[PDB]
Amino acid sequence: AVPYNRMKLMIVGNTGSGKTTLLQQLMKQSATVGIDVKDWPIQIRDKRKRDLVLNVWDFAGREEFYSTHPHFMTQRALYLAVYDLSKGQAEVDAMKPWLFNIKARASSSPVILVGTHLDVSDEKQRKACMSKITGFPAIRDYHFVNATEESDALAKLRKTIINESLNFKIRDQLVVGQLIPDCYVELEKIILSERKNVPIEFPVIDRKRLLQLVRENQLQLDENELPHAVHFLNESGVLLHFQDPALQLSDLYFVEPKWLCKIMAQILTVNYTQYFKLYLLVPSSLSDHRPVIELPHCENSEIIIRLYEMPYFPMGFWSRLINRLLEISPPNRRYWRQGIYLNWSPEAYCLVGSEVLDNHPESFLKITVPSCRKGCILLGQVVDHIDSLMEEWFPGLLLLKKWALYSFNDGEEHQKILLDDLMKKAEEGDLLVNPDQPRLTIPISQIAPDLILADLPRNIMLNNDELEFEQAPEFLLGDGSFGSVYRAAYEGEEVAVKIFNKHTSLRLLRQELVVLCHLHHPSLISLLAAGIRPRMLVMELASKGSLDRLLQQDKASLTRTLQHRIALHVADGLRYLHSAMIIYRDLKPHNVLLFTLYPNAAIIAKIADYGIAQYCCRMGIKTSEGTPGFRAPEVARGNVIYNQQADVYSFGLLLYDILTTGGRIVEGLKFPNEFDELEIQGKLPDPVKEYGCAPWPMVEKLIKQCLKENPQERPTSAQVFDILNSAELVCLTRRILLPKNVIVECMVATHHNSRNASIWLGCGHTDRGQLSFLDLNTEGYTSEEVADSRILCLALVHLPVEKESWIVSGTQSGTLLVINTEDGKKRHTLEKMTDSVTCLYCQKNFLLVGTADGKLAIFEDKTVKLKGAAPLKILNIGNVSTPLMCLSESTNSTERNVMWGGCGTKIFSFSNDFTIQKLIETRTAFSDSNIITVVVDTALYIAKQNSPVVEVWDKKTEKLCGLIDCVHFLREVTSYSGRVKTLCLQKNTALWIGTGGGHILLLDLSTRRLIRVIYNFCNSVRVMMTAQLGSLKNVMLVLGYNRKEIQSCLTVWDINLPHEVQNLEKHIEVRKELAEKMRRTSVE
Ligand SMILES: Nc1nc2c(ncn2[C@@H]2O[C@H](COP(=O)(O)OP(=O)(O)O)[C@@H](O)[C@H]2O)c(=O)[nH]1
Ligand SMILES: CNc1nc(Nc2cn(C(C)(C)C#N)nc2C)ncc1C(F)(F)F
User: Fold this and answer.
1) 111 C-alpha vs ligand 1 centroid, how far in Å?
2) Who's near 493: CB < 8 A, 6+ residues apart?
3) Is 496 helix (H, G, I), strand (E, B) or coil?
4) Contacts 24+ apart (CB under 8 A), 551-555
5) Using a 6 Å cutoff on CB, does residue 539 contact ligand 2?
6) Which residues form the Protein kinase domain (predicted)?
């Protein structure tokens, strides 16, 4: 609670007047380039008044530094002002724009003023004007004194700061007597000490260093209170934490404010510094003459002329104007400091640039185009750009008064009539009349074509004789705070007219039209006509209604594909928008219209109501708009300036609205305090936990990845459109995780629909064999070690005899365990085979157990109730060196009597007669291996371990047909792990290859044509099968490995994946011929 008395006293002195020498003769050069921060203490007469140390900032006056200065005129500062008196009131006039800049930039700062050079001060001349001076700031004194011999009343700054504790208070608080805790002064001291060791040519530090040292010094600085502390320390004037996300300076921290200021000379003397945000951005070097450039069309009628009457050119105005107006994609440029001259041809050229030959002290901006049509488009674009600029960065100007210079009779001077009356004179009726002679008349289309909307293409022109809507409130739709969208016809159509309200400034209509009439796309609603007589808009009436009351009402039509269409077409719209420097800031689920609820359409969403879409270059925006609940975080704290990534957060919120199927918006339509509790961050639940939805675990991974606070950690709109354009994201259903230090190499589902999924997981990591039992809809991992050796294979048979079901296992020790699927305690162990257990598999129901010794082990389905038995004879169809681990079933006409398989490195088959009807060895390189699985759709696709190839032997000719290599197919994904540890088959579409390298391979069936390849989610694929789920078929389990900590995910894949990767690819192929057919018309 120590009183920390420190505040800046930036002595802002116009050039030449001696701004430096005054403080030189107060405390104790030639041209002080940039800011020069000295230091200065105070020991007042009353010793109880603590040290009032003041970080003096000694600014400069050369216009380049005028332009680079106005970002360091912060609050908590007692300014000054200096002006010579030998030049009399002229210096007062010259300092008047500077005082205006002061009162514009800083409002809570007193402004003393002082003269200089009392040796030649003719105060009787300018005294009257100086008294008449006191929009200005609160001038509090006038002490015109000498410069070198300080004999007048000086040191009054102390008596005007220490007594200004409450007379200069930051919102009634204490400035010079702020009882600040010890933590803040601790941080200040440690930074002031560490200022040395950090390099001197570019002193910067990382926030991680600050945290590490604060922990090393036990500063007791909490991470949730650290940014407020560093912000106060910044505003004190010892370091500069530029936390502006539009500048990306949120990480790098600065320790020497003295250094940041004296870089203007370093950069005008003619890395990673390349962000000079204060093509090229060196406005110091620009010449400041009136160049030798003459208009081609030099008359009083052939050229339009606009004007702008402004009190004071704001510090850093012309810089922003040129940096904006060097967008040249709508050109021999000759831009000096102020007046850019965008020449194209003798037909169209916009010559912006000031003019002060007005016989008056005011400052005049002017625009000039030759009065053909292209000139009118140019003028009606530059007016929009200048008005956006002046409405975003410099709100104080709107004082501003327009001026349109028309000419009644050619070959004479032009009169001056302003737009606040021309608006009415052109809204009542066209053909502006000449009061002197009524026979003389001029058109309002070659005087100011930004007032009749003639600066737009000729196709979008109203046809009011065919707009038959009555204003009757029966036809009503949304009311977006500016208009009210009715339902109407237009020459025969369904069109949603948007009549504007009683009084709306035409700037709004142009704010909407400049985005609706330039960039076309099949995801952005397309304007049909826009008049001016009632100031209306006509937009293509979206049939199926806005999204909000399709969420609240029609929850049945909302499938799990449509939820990825109305979240992909919107991402398309956002990508196109942000690709042309427009930002939207309004993407809420009341503003996504629909056109068709049939899933596989082509145009399903189209954004609308572009009420607040402003232009946003790399500089950014400074205002704060939107709507509570759907606003970006940094929009709330309106002080910071943001850019085109305060929109992707709105998209994340829309996505959380969609995934919840309208639970957040309906539970928050009661109290907007609930919807604004998370307006910054930190109050969003995990969706599946509460609202009862179904999982979607490649969206939940994105929904947090585009929701973070740090405006650089969020994706760019392209990157958040190239994650949804992948059929790997629509076709999962779940993703479970298993504990640490456990593997899985044996799986059996339960199609009997006890809980519709009661997946067992045989494992053998330890010596004893474990037997997990996972439930799907609840995720209960109730493992139980009930075996002595590894559990190689499991199998299930739901006995129809007495409606039973008894899961059966197998052991590496060669034992046949049996457990009741319903009775948790029945260990009806059967007769152990003569060797180990290799595989098992299920009319004629019988367990076709496979042993390591190469002998077929068969049982009886009815022999389950027994306790130890060898039901049917063993068929030793192999040797000790033949591992009989192959078993499978048949699919061709479901003829299970054609049950295939293969004994070791050899293929065989049999029937219910149990005789080998065919035995074909596979001795035909990799042939020194064994066999894993066979599958029969039309032939036998046979896999084998450590093989980048899978063979194809036919069941009718018994010969090789083709060799479908795997590593060859994977040769363009990135000595590879291109093995095939598993091989599952769909019903009648395509193969499903599972590669131990961590890649699903959706090989198709026709000849060899690949369809896609899945990657970057696992590290291996242990065992794959196909089961049922929730009374419905079509799921495809996959057991991914993570290997060193072993993690065995258990994914769930919909089996409609092939026709997905096809359908969605055809869809995206369709609408990208439209996205170029529509767009190419806008250039034409
Ligand atoms: N003749 C005269 N010259 C002065 C007086 N006070 C200051 N100067 C000159 O003004 C110069 C300082 O200008 P300066 O304040 O640095 O200009 P700035 O950098 O644009 O602010 C010094 O070189 C002095 O020679 C004065 O009372 N009489
Ligand atoms: C946002 N306003 C618009 N709304 C629509 N579609 C729409 C149709 N209905 C109903 C249910 C009445 C029907 N049929 N409701 C809505 C929101 N189309 C166009 C717009 C537009 F022009 F304002 F963008």
Assistant:
1) 22
2) 528, 541
3) strand
4) 551/589, 551/657, 551/658, 551/661, 551/662, 551/665, 552/662, 552/665, 552/666, 554/597, 555/661, 555/662
5) yes
6) 471-730
Beta strand 2-3 with 179-180: parallel, antiparallel or unpaired? antiparallel
Which residues are 56's β-sheet partners?
Answer: none
| Token couple for 973 | 């994904």
Q: Decide if 310 contacts 400 (C-beta within 8 A).
A: yes
Rounded to 5 degrees, φ, ψ at 850 are: -115, 135
478 Cβ inside 6 Å of ligand 2:
yes
Angle at CA 462, nearest 5°, toward 457 and 467? 155
> Distances in Å between the alpha carbon of 842 and those of 797, 870, 1025?
7, 17, 14
Between the alpha carbon of residue 829 and those of residues 32, 148, 345, 726, 798, the distances in Å are 96, 110, 95, 49, 18
Query: Is 498 annotated as contributing to ligand binding?
Result: yes
Measured distance CA(123)–CA(130) in Å, rounded:
10
The span from the CA of 1052 to the CA of 1041, in Å, is 14
Tell which atom from ligand 1 comes closest to the C-alpha of 30.
Answer: 23
One-letter amino acid at 80 equals L
Residues that are catalytic? 586
How far, in Å, are 384, 526, 1024 from residue 510 at the CA level? 8, 15, 59
Q: For 162-177, b where at least 16 C-beta lie within 10 A, e where not — what string?
A: bebbeebeeeeeebbb
Counting ligands in written order, the one closest to the CA of 490 is: 2
Helices and strands in the chain: count of H runs, count of E runs: 25, 39
Give the span between the Cα atoms of 129 and 93, in whole angstroms. Answer: 9
Q: Does ligand 2 lie within 6 Å of residue 609's CB atom?
A: yes
Locate all alpha helices (DSSP H) within 400-505, ordered by sequence. 419-428
Residues 6+ apart with CB under 8 A from 483: 498, 499, 500, 501, 504, 537
Alpha-carbon distances of 108 from 73, 111, 168, rounded to whole Å? 12, 10, 8
